[PDB]
């Protein structure tokens with residue numbers, strides 16, 4: 001196992017994300033630019049008018065059902081450790097509205113998780129037969145925020161003319177996409193699994209422009225130290241790529257083999 | 258001395274900014290919203306195209322002569338402690354271009370100070386005759402980043418119809434010019450009083466974008482500021498051209514230019 005980078009994020013995350021290769025001679029991938037938060041090339045005109053934000057007037061730590069931001073989320077789904085409650089619907093997640101800079105509450109209130117960024121110890125590594133992948137170095141309890149799907153925000157019309165579509169996440173009115181091909185974070189290396197240990201959740205933080213949810217992966221179960229991360233890429237991906245290759249996730253319940 | 262808030266920023270800064278009143282019974286100011294970063298109401302159309310960033314290719318910590326970002330700034334003006342070099346021209350500051358997310362360097366490189374946020378221990382306090390002011394609770398060495406002038410980014414045409422103009426900071430022409438209004442949304446800097454021999458100087462800084470219409474305004478210390486001293490900057494001639502007919506400067510400098 002060769003260490004090919006001590007940190008693919010170059011210090012932009014809380015902790016480093018090293019890259020190792022125990023399989024072959026490929027060096028650390030360098031065909032893209034690591035960015036820790038979303039970017040644009042062509043302008044997106046995201047609504048950032050501060051007076052358009054809904055916000056709460058809580059005098060506590062936003063643990064009561066009176067919190068407007070919890071109400072927008074149906075309820076606040078976070079426990080005091082920032083983990084999703086047992087009742088959270090992993091099969092059909094709601095939208096999460098975290099507290100923002102317009103709220104009366106403090107920056108340490110209960111309804112702030114994704115806005116605090118990536119915390120888990122992750123590693124980019126060479127898989128046996130699925131190129132690069134991402135693993136957790138430590139145990140991750142169920143319902144824990146793992147990482148955001150970060151990249152270049154683009155229009156559907158722009159996605160329609162992109163040659164490489166293997167690093168797209170659809171935000172689907174007007175519809176948009178996150179393309180992690182040229183600019184992306186660690187999430188661009190996460191492989192597909194049919195019984196995934198991550199689920200994507202649509203989250204609003206500093207803006208509430210519903211065209212532009214941010215995509216937060218939360219653990220669907222206990223992820224043991226060493227395990228590869230995976231999420232369900234969905235049907236659009238497989239309708240297209242199923243023509244070219246079959247799923248190698250190896251699940252007994254694999255739906256694309 | 259009554260402590261009226263342990264932190265006006267509600268935990269949004271690296272350190273608390275308490276408010277005290279040892280003069281009268283005025284409560285902690287509450288007729289504005291504290292924001293730690295600039296905001297907009299009407300859209301500003303800031304150029305955030307990542308391919309429009311100029312960036313560096315440094316293989317080190319950006320302390321060499323060769324850093325592109327330093328070159329844009331004339332040279333990198335920051336020493337190893339994040340303080341402006343002695344040669345920095347306080348009377349005529351250059352534009353500073355800090356490193357950014359398009360640069361090849363690491364997040365801990367030398368050319369990153371303002372983007373790391375407010376670090377000095379500050380306090381909002383009631384002054385005897387100039388309302389609220391801000392003081393340092395610690396010694397601040399010369400050339401230290403103290404705080405950013407944060408508020409609502411507005412056009413000159415919007416500034417033209419803003420009745421309350423006592424919390425405005427004018428930005429740079431280009432035939433297009435903007436302002437930061439800290440009246441409704443602002444950080445601690447909205448409370449800093451004017452001084453004719455100021456211990457702070459505003460420096461125009463670029464970080465995540467390089468849209469020259471929207472420099473960010475970073476106050477740096479012009480000298481050693483002693484623990485307890487009130488912070489001050491020079492509001493400039495436009496402020497005093499307008500407000501001079503309503504009141505005179507009470508900074509108390511023996512060289513006061515607006516008394």
Ligand SMILES: C[S@@+](CC[C@H](N)C(=O)[O-])C[C@H]1O[C@@H](n2cnc3c(N)ncnc32)[C@H](O)[C@@H]1O
Pocket residue numbers: 130131132133166167188189190191192193241245246247248249
């Ligand atoms: C977003 S990338 C993931 C990172 C990729 N392995 C790499 O090396 O860059 C998606 C691509 O990885 C491969 N891949 C991901 N999951 C897979 C799976 N379950 N079975 C087969 N190939 C997969 C496919 O080539 C797919 O188009």
Ligand SMILES: C[S@@+](CC[C@H](N)C(=O)[O-])C[C@H]1O[C@@H](n2cnc3c(N)ncnc32)[C@H](O)[C@@H]1O
Pocket residue numbers: 387388389390423424447448449450451452500504505506507508
């Ligand atoms: C940006 S505010 C500063 C905070 C203000 N003291 C407060 O209590 O909100 C500007 C106002 O403070 C007062 N002020 C600031 N510096 C002053 C000075 N040197 N002399 C007289 N008044 C001053 C004036 O009323 C001025 O319009």
Ligand SMILES: [Cl-]
Pocket residue numbers: 082112113114116
């Ligand atoms: Cl958190």
Ligand SMILES: [Cl-]
Pocket residue numbers: 206207
């Ligand atoms: Cl954002």
Ligand SMILES: [Cl-]
Pocket residue numbers: 465466
């Ligand atoms: Cl910015």
Ligand SMILES: [Zn+2]
Pocket residue numbers: 056057058061062067068069070099103105
């Ligand atoms: Zn609340």
Ligand SMILES: [Zn+2]
Pocket residue numbers: 056058061062099100103105106109110111
């Ligand atoms: Zn809250």
Ligand SMILES: [Zn+2]
Pocket residue numbers: 055056057062067068069098099100103104105111
């Ligand atoms: Zn809230």
Ligand SMILES: [Zn+2]
Pocket residue numbers: 193194247248249250251253254255256257
């Ligand atoms: Zn499968």
Ligand SMILES: [Zn+2]
Pocket residue numbers: 313314315318319323324325326327356360362368
């Ligand atoms: Zn450099």
Ligand SMILES: [Zn+2]
Pocket residue numbers: 312313314319325326355356357360361362368
């Ligand atoms: Zn740089």
Ligand SMILES: [Zn+2]
Pocket residue numbers: 313315318319326356357360362363366367368
């Ligand atoms: Zn640098």
Ligand SMILES: [Zn+2]
Pocket residue numbers: 452453506507508509510513514515516
């Ligand atoms: Zn004076």
